[PDB]
């Protein structure tokens, strides 16, 4: 695999992963981070899946060419939220913003109350009830004393 | 019920089952050999029941009416009977859920539905049953708080899988009763439902992936975004010239 | 004198909760 | 003793826990600045900017990377909660011990996870998020801004938890100079903010109910929202009381109740036959079925 | 008590067999527990809190609705008294406590399919011999037919008597003020649900009351000027959300009663109550007290679905006959307007601009719904929400009879 | 009263409330609002204009 | 009046103020507004005890027009009416307002 002979396809449904950022202007190999997982793989159990993502930067940088190995079949990104949040734009990495889809009650002029899509996407911004309950006792309730 | 001289309705035994005798296969089984019975007897003296029977005298002109109304007086003064019923709830709750997780484990079971069911799940024992009910049990006692016994003695026989509830007594005559005791319908079940459905598309956001993993030498100099291909996956599986390994 | 009497608290929390800076210090100001 | 003492008095407390009221933000998922952003000082000045300069805290991360993570009650201003919880770390760590609860404990390495017992872990992880999120979406005092911000409607004043205040209403941000961030919160609808509908029953009295719209999401709403729906279902009029307690006592002790306005009482007191019915038997099953068990009895 | 009741299954829009899957079954009621007092575990105070905007069941009537369909397949003793299996599927004793796969060994007989079934109680003895354990069923069939005899919204029935409400009644209501309808409707249901009441009990009484009051503020009569007994219902605004309504006491003035004891039968004529939880609740809510207390007389057949011409038992079109009346949302929220504004509530210039907005707000209704369909088509198998037409939803009914039944019900 | 900053030396620009970045010269005007809501930027980029 | 003309949709009075501008007072804005005309009078005419306080402290401060009455078991409602008779100091105070 290392020298680009051999494609392995890993038959996992699901899996626990994790990521590991780096910067895009300096020399890397990813080949010693996957050794490592592998070298913690038993018929017990495995380490959850390692990955590897170029930190996003504000200006046209000069990138060094570095390998990588892993990567998904499909899109299992929607985690992420945004990037670079605090600049002007995003020049060179993976440029997300802010998706208006998880915000319909706040940027949606056609916004309902009392509207929603739970089972396939969560909105953070929603309107809601609140209430003031009292919790009388029971003597709270009737005239307590004999009858 | 008090049965009186009626010798085929002389009731011999009540019994409790902790599970459903129709999974196993005892669907036309003796009752007694498929539900535990009780066993309790007090002696008493004849000659203390007499005594009391003859020597009973009251008050010369007690009103009863009156008598009870000051009796019963202060045992009506609290929630005392109310918790029981808050504790009948939460038991009802816990002993759903903790249905509904076991057979979601199990390949199928008391038909109930299976949103995570792409999932793996090989270990199916028993054993695997009893740890996760256990879970079940301690996670609802810590969330309301609660102390006794609840939820327990069901895993008494060790197969949580086929737990149920039932009561019978037998007649001399051969009769039997056989009730059954459902659970009824419980709100939370339904929410973890919803819940399971909700997660099974925003997994992501709990640190968990779907799909297989590729591991291809790629000497990139730009952007790198694994978790997001834009292209399509090469060779597919049944694709040609791929190949599987053996399963050794 | 000229009467005043203090807000309610909750007014005062929100108002002083936002106020930004008037004056801030960066290199690019003409 | 023990026995005949239990037996005896029912007066021992140990009811179920279920008065919990929140007062902060009905949420489970955290905004997550994960990679922090670098400050520039000599070259490419002015490219990011931080709300810190300006003395106020931003409505979202602002870091060079950000994640949406799961942590139960993290913003839950009020009453102690249930007592556990689900708080998963950052994608750039293991995150592999909330997935530990069952067929791990002696099998797999500290370091691992069960791939072959993924399905039962994870739905015990989200039954614990579940009954972590069992509370009740409790009223807070609302009030109006004098400031120039305002929307014309009151808001929720966090007292004591300014951060909150600023963290609930996006649309309320101070935005300069146009970064990302605010390149998405300029398009805010202006009013979407504050209490928009009450039940005010008694004069210079606190509103029974509420409705507002703030920072929620729907999953915990819809929690919640059914918790106090199961609440409501064991709850009945004063008159059914009064009138269970009458025939309780066999009609003796006839009580009664006063007529007047009860704007929001809650007691959640009763349940059905076949929830009697079963925990009668689940009681049966858990005791022995000895003569020494009955004899206290 | 109640000893015998009568029932109607569904009705087939043309497809051979009930329209539920399995799934459906298993979801709404599947792990072995009791189906009979579920109605209210998947409904909350308000739309926002549901997950009936997509998906499976994406609708506020949806699951009721499947439910309905579901129970037609297994009603069969009130009809051939004998349990019977369909799919696989059947009780799991004479009780009908739950369902349950059949039994390989002796399995009952495959029931044969049919559709309109009319139901007895006397078909069935051990029901009556059981009546303590059983009652719950009686609230349920009841439900079911009061919604299968009629298209678009299910039918139910309103009366007010002629004499002032008893103390009782007031008392609780007092307690039940700021109360959201959906929770109240619970409460009806879970009361007569559980166990056998007489019609002559307190709260019959007391949800009869609501259910008037609640009709008599929907047509506008009942108003912060105007109130029976002091109560009344608030409905939230059309401007965010009209789907809402709350129990209300004023010191307002208080209506007359009736110089006659008036009833009649209501149902909603445009499909808007399959996603609007107020006439939900509010159906649900009144059919409860005609499940504990029979129906007081035949409904009348005259504006029914052709299914429900003559049903015995249940429609008729003789003397003694009680109308069914039926409204459009839409012009009832414009009748509603107009007496805020006779009473002095509004100005002329608000009301303009309610009509407006509740326009607006019911065209996103029909807009959802209609769109809905087309992606549930019926020949799919199950029916998620009822079968309409575009010209449904511009029906006025008999609209300006109902808010004359108001006129003369709150004097 | 958000400004826009540009990279490589174009002079920065202010957000017409049509939501589109005009220049800075020129004529404008300011509802009291965003000048109480803007001023530190104001006192930076526009006032020494 | 002076509530009256901060809420601009309340009770009918003469508003010559209108031109100024002002946010709409809630019920916890107008109680402020009550207790400081509530203390200017106490002050002006030096009394003790008090004179409107309940007014400010508990209910709506945005009265119209004080009503008492008394509800019969039959239903009628007798209310009695308590419009205020003609000030004096209103009216110079509308002058002042109006120059």
């Given at each position: 695999v290392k020298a680009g002979r051999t494609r392995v396809l890993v038959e996992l449904g699901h899996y626990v992963y994790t990521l590991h950022y780096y910067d895009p202007q300096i020399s890397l190999d990813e080949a010693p981070i996957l050794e490592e997982w592998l070298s913690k793989i038993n018929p017990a159990g495995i380490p959850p899946v390692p990955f590897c993502i170029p930190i996003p930067q504000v200006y046209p940088c000069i990138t060094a060419r570095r390998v990588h190995y892993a990567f998904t079949s499909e899109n299992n990104n929607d985690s992420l939220f945004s990037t670079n949040a605090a600049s002007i734009d995003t020049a060179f990495g993976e440029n997300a913003a802010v998706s208006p889809l998880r915000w319909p009650g706040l940027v949606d002029p056609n916004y309902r109350v009392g509207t929603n899509d739970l089972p396939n996407r969560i909105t953070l911004y929603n309107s809601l009830y609140?209430?003031?309950?009292?919790?009388?006792?029971?003597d709270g309730i009737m005239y307590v004393r004999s009858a | 019920p008090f049965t009186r001289l009626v010798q085929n309705d002389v009731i011999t035994n009540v019994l409790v089952a902790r599970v459903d005798p129709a999974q196993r296969g005892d669907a036309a089984v003796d009752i007694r050999a498929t539900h535990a019975t009780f066993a309790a007897a007090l002696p008493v003296d004849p000659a203390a029941i007499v005594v009391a029977m003859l020597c009973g005298q009251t008050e010369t002109n007690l009103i009863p009416?009156?008598?009870?109304?000051?009796?019963?007086?202060?045992?009506?003064?609290?929630?005392?009977?109310?918790?029981?019923?808050?504790?009948?709830?939460?038991?009802?709750?816990?002993?759903?859920?903790?249905?509904?997780?076991?057979?979601?484990?199990?390949?199928?079971?008391?038909?109930?539905?299976?949103?995570?069911?792409?999932?793996?799940?090989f270990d199916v024992t028993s054993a695997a049953a009893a740890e996760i009910m256990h879970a079940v049990n301690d996670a609802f006692k810590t969330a309301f708080d609660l102390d006794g016994a609840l939820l327990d003695g069901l895993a008494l026989y060790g197969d949580?899988?086929?737990?149920?509830?039932?009561?019978?007594?037998?007649?001399?005559?051969?009769?039997?009763?056989?009730?059954?005791?459902?659970?009824?319908?419980?709100?939370?079940?339904?929410?973890?439902?919803?819940?399971?459905?909700?997660?099974?598309?925003?997994?992501?956001?709990?640190?968990?992936?779907?799909?297989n993993l590729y591991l291809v030498q790629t000497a990139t100099n730009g952007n790198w975004s694994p978790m997001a291909p834009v292209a399509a996956p090469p060779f597919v599986r049944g694709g040609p010239n791929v190949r599987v390994v053996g399963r050794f | 004198d000229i009467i005043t009497r203090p807000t309610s608290d909750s007014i005062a929390a929100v108002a002083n909760a936002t106020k930004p800076a008037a004056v801030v210090s960066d290199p690019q100001s003409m | 003793?023990?026995?005949?003492?239990?037996?005896?008095?029912?007066?021992?407390?140990?009811?179920?826990?279920?008065?919990?009221?929140?007062?902060?933000?009905?949420?489970?998922?955290?905004?997550?600045?994960?990679?922090?952003?670098?400050?520039?000082?000599?070259?490419?000045?002015?490219?990011?900017?931080?709300?810190?300069?300006?003395?106020?805290?931003?409505?979202?991360?602002?870091?060079?990377?950000?994640?949406?993570?799961?942590?139960?009650?993290?913003?839950?201003?009020?009453?102690?909660?249930?007592?556990?919880?689900?708080?998963?770390?950052?994608?750039?760590?293991?995150?592999?011990?909330?997935?530990?609860?069952?067929?791990?404990?002696?099998?797999?390495?500290?370091?691992?996870?069960?791939?072959?017992?993924?399905?039962?872990?994870?739905?015990?992880?989200?039954?614990?998020?579940?009954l972590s999120n069992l509370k009740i979406n409790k009223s807070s005092t609302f009030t109006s801004d004098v400031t120039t911000i305002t929307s014309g409607r009151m808001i929720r004043a966090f007292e004591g938890r300014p951060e909150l205040l600023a963290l609930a209403y996006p649309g309320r941000a101070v935005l300069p100079t146009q970064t990302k961030n605010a390149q998405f919160l300029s398009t805010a609808i202006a009013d979407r903010i504050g209490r928009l509908d009450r039940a005010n029953l008694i004069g210079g009295e606190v509103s029974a109910m509420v409705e507002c719209m703030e920072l929620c999401d729907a999953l915990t709403l819809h929690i919640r929202e059914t918790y106090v729906m199961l609440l409501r279902s064991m709850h009945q009029d004063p008159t059914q009381i009064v009138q269970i307690v009458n025939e309780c006592a066999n009609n003796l002790l006839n009580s009664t109740i006063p007529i007047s306005l009860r704007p929001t009482i809650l007691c959640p007191w009763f349940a059905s036959s076949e929830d009697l019915r079963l925990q009668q038997v689940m009681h049966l099953v858990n005791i022995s079925s000895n003569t020494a068990a009955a004899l206290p009895l | 008590a109640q000893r015998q009741f009568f029932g109607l299954t569904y009705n087939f829009y043309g497809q051979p067999a009930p329209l539920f899957d399995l799934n459906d079954l298993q979801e709404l009621a599947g792990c072995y527990a009791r189906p009979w007092t579920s109605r209210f575990s998947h409904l909350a105070i308000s739309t926002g809190s549901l997950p009936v905007w997509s998906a499976?069941?994406?609708?506020?009537?949806?699951?009721?609705?499947?439910?309905?369909?579901?129970?037609?397949?297994?009603?069969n003793p009130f009809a051939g008294g004998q349990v019977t299996s369909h799919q696989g599927i059947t009780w799991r004793d004479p009780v009908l406590s739950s369902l349950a796969p059949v039994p390989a060994i002796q399995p009952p007989p495959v029931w044969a399919v049919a559709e309109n079934v009319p139901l007895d109680s006397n078909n069935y003895p051990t029901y009556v011999l059981?009546?303590?354990?059983?009652?719950?069923?009686?609230?349920?069939?009841?439900?079911?037919?009061?919604?299968?005899?009629?298209?678009?919204?299910?039918?139910?029935?309103?009366?007010?008597?002629?004499?002032?409400?008893?103390?009782?009644?007031?008392?609780?209501?007092?307690?039940?003020?700021?109360?959201?309808?959906?929770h109240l409707a619970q409460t009806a249901y879970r009361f007569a649900g559980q166990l056998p009441q007489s019609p002559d009990s307190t709260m019959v009484s007391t949800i009869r009351w609501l259910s008037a009051i609640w009709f008599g503020s929907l047509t506008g009569r009942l108003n912060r000027s105007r109130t029976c007994n002091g109560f009344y219902f608030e409905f939230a605004k059309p401007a965010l959300n009209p789907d809402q309504a709350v129990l209300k006491w004023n010191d307002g003035a208080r209506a007359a009663p009736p110089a006659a004891a008036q009833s009649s039968y209501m149902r909603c004529i445009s499909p808007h109550w399959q996603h609007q939880i107020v006439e939900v609740a509010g159906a649900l809510m009144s059919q409860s007290v005609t499940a504990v207390t029979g129906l007081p007389a035949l409904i009348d057949e005259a504006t029914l679905p052709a299914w429900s011409q003559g049903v015995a038992n249940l429609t008729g079109n003789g003397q003694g006959v009680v109308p069914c009346l039926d409204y459009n949302p839409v012009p009832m929220a414009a009748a509603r307007h107009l007496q805020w504004r006779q009473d002095?509530?509004?100005?002329?210039?608000?009301?303009?601009?309610?009509?407006?907005?509740?326009?607006?707000?019911?065209?996103?209704?029909?807009?959802?719904?209609?769109?809905?369909?087309?992606?549930?088509?019926?020949?799919?198998?199950?029916?998620?929400?009822?079968?309409?037409n575009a010209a449904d939803f511009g029906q006025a009914g008999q609209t300006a009879a109902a808010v004359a039944l108001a006129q003369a019900m709150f004097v | 009263g958000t400004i826009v900053p540009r990279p490589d030396g174009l002079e920065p620009q202010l957000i017409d409330d049509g939501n589109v970045p005009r220049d800075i010269a020129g004529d404008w005007v300011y509802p009291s609002d965003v000048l109480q809501v803007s001023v530190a930027v104001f006192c930076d980029y526009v006032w020494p204009m």
């Open positions: 609140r209430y003031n309950f009292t919790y009388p006792t029971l | 009416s009156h008598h009870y109304g000051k009796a019963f007086a202060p045992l009506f003064a609290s929630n005392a009977m109310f918790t029981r019923n808050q504790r009948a709830v939460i038991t009802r709750e816990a002993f759903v859920c903790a249905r509904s997780a076991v057979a979601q484990c199990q390949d199928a079971g008391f038909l109930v539905p299976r949103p995570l069911d792409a999932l793996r799940q949580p899988r086929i737990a149920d509830l039932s009561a019978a007594y037998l007649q001399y005559g051969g009769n039997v009763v056989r009730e059954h005791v459902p659970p009824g319908p419980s709100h939370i079940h339904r929410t973890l439902q919803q819940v399971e459905s909700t997660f099974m598309a925003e997994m992501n956001l709990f640190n968990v992936a779907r799909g | - | 003793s023990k026995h005949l003492s239990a037996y005896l008095d029912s007066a021992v407390a140990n009811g179920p826990e279920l008065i919990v009221e929140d007062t902060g933000l009905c949420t489970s998922f955290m905004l997550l600045d994960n990679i922090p952003s670098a400050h520039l000082t000599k070259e490419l000045i002015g490219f990011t900017w931080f709300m810190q300069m300006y003395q106020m805290t931003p409505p979202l991360p602002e870091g060079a990377v950000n994640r949406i993570v799961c942590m139960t009650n993290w913003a839950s201003l009020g009453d102690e909660g249930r007592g556990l919880e689900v708080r998963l770390p950052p994608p750039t760590d293991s995150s592999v011990h909330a997935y530990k609860t069952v067929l791990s404990r002696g099998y797999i390495d500290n370091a691992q996870f069960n791939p072959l017992a993924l399905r039962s872990n994870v739905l015990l992880m989200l039954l614990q998020f579940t | 499976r069941y994406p609708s506020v009537a949806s699951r009721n609705i499947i439910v309905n369909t579901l129970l037609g397949a297994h009603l059981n009546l303590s354990s059983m009652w719950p069923i009686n609230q349920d069939v009841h439900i079911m037919t009061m919604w299968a005899l009629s298209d678009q919204g299910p039918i139910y029935h309103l009366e007010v008597p002629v004499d002032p409400m008893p103390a009782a009644t007031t008392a609780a209501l007092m307690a039940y003020i700021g109360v959201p309808i959906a002095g509530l509004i100005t002329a210039a608000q009301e303009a601009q309610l009509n407006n907005d509740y326009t607006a707000y019911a065209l996103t209704i029909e807009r959802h719904l209609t769109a809905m369909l087309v992606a549930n088509p019926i020949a799919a198998g199950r029916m998620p929400i009822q079968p309409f | -």
